[PDB]
Design a protein around this ligand. Sequence first.
Ligand SMILES: Cc1nnn(C)c1-c1cnc2c3cc(F)c(C(C)(C)O)cc3n([C@H](c3ccccc3)C3CCOCC3)c2c1
Ligand code: NA
Length: 125
Amino acid sequence: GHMNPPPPETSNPNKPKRQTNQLQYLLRVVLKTLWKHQFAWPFQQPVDAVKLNLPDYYKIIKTPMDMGTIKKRLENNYYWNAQECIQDFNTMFTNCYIYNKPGDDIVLMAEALEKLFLQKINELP
Ligand SMILES: Cc1nnn(C)c1-c1cnc2c3cc(F)c(C(C)(C)O)cc3n([C@H](c3ccccc3)C3CCOCC3)c2c1
Ligand code: NA
């Protein structure tokens, strides 16, 4: 009846690459801190709508994003500007709030990670 879309692209080999203080901070400080949070595990890979039986997930969410994709993107120097990476983290949180309702365990988890994300991102060098 329903299948998953392909996961987001994690490499852009025809684009030029660079290291900046903000991109290193996004990988080694922001992503590293969120990845090891007690409630990070549902956000470390794309939503498997097939395994989780969510046939409406990819009908409601057209810009899926997850930390596993952000991690691979940062490791492949996918981002040239730190604001592109920040936008992917914000898309991941906004998708969770769009699909789910307050009081849902996944939302409580998302709100805790979002608080930690905002604390580290507000200190962006
Ligand atoms: C939905 C949704 N919307 N945004 N996100 C980011 C999600 C999301 C993403 N990944 C997982 C996920 C990955 C898993 F591997 C497992 C296993 C197979 C081990 O059970 C469960 C997983 N669930 C559960 C879940 C929530 C609602 C409906 C069905 C399943 C959560 C997990 C946390 O506790 C509460 C229930 C996810 C929800
Ligand atoms: Na909601």
